[PDB]
Design a protein around this ligand. Structure first.
Ligand SMILES: [Ca+2]
Ligand SMILES: [Ca+2]
Lengths: 123, 123
């Protein structure tokens, strides 16, 4: 769920408020997204979306009435490391990995303030 | 919460249904408890209770209206290992450790069927 994702990002980037810093960044970070990613951080978001798009094409995921961001799952943050729990059933397990990969991607790429809130006439 | 505890025990003892196998075992496993533990597994439960009793004596724990078994926290089970997440605030962090220690204790002691449901006239 959105909330586990926010914590995963803070697990990796302890100094940020992910809901503020990465929201509406580029053509992909935040709600919706189109066009060509503007940078690599924007590319982490595009991949993240494709991963959620894939989750949706799984017979295991077509049971929960809730969205990937409403689909809670369990993980832990320990020594700045993310671990998706084995108690997660198939679908939750797929979403957890999608969020874990994105959180890690965010922490490995440059963040360009000059792309914050981005004029969506560039996407 | 009770539910995270059940999973922690299954994380360590993959073959059991903790709510069935360890419920009402001895003088301490299950609801309430008094007397002298009947065996070591019963002693894991007594310790577990004392840990919850300690949790209650913490200024951090006197905010949540819910019980230690209603007090959800987050952890993950990975390769039969339990990790209490750093996203847990102080109180949840204390309960998580109490449950983790008990789950591990259960998995290291003998289980005597001859103590299942135990006549509470022996406690
Ligand atoms: Ca998006
Ligand atoms: Ca008890």
């Amino acid at each position: 769920a959105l909330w586990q994702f926010n914590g995963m990002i803070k697990c990796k980037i302890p100094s940020s408020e992910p809901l503020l810093d990465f929201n509406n960044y580029g053509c992909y970070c935040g709600l919706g997204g189109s066009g060509t990613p503007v940078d690599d951080l924007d590319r982490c978001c595009q991949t993240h979306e494709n991963c959620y798009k894939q989750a949706k094409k799984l017979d295991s995921c077509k049971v929960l009435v809730d969205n990937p961001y409403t689909n809670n799952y369990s993980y832990s943050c320990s020594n700045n490391e993310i671990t998706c729990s084995s108690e997660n059933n198939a679908c939750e397990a797929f979403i957890c990995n999608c969020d874990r990969n994105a959180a890690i991607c965010f922490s490995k790429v440059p963040y360009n303030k000059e792309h914050k809130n981005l004029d969506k006439k560039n996407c």
